[PDB]
Amino acid sequence: SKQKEAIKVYLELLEVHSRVLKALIEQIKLFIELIKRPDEDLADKVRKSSEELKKIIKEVEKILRKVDDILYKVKS
């Protein structure tokens, strides 16, 4: 059923948002130390965490496309 389909989407979002929390907390801590003291190794792992967030964006765009596929078939 389509209500079970919206359940699968939300479960996917929980797993995604957990990695958003983990990535966002790391970036804030890294900036706290960068503001107190600049360090290139710290700046590098900020760029690494930013790239991880970019891949998460792509995962959320894939979730959205799959939901739009269902909505398009429902409204058809």
């Binding site: 907390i25 804030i28 503001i35």
Partner: protein, 78 residues
């Protein structure tokens, strides 16, 4: 006292809320899996989705508070 140290304090508090959120998510995933393996009514699927919706909403609100703290961090150095 110090503004950056106040933000450091607030992030540690929000980090603990993230840990508690993840713990609640794991309890939900176990209940959903138990509900998936059982023949549920359309009302049973309703209460399950409402349960999942509340956990999703709580988790996003933790993210928003993190971002609002993040914003305060940016405004300090500006």
């Amino acid at each position: 006292s110090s503004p950056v140290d106040e933000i450091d304090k607030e992030v540690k508090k929000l980090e603990e809320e993230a840990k508690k959120s993840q713990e609640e998510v794991e309890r939900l995933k176990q209940e959903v899996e138990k509900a998936s393996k059982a023949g549920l009514d359309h009302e049973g699927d309703s209460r399950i989705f409402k349960k999942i919706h509340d956990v999703v909403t709580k988790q996003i609100k933790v993210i928003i508070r993190l971002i609002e703290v993040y914003v305060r961090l940016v405004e300090i150095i500006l």
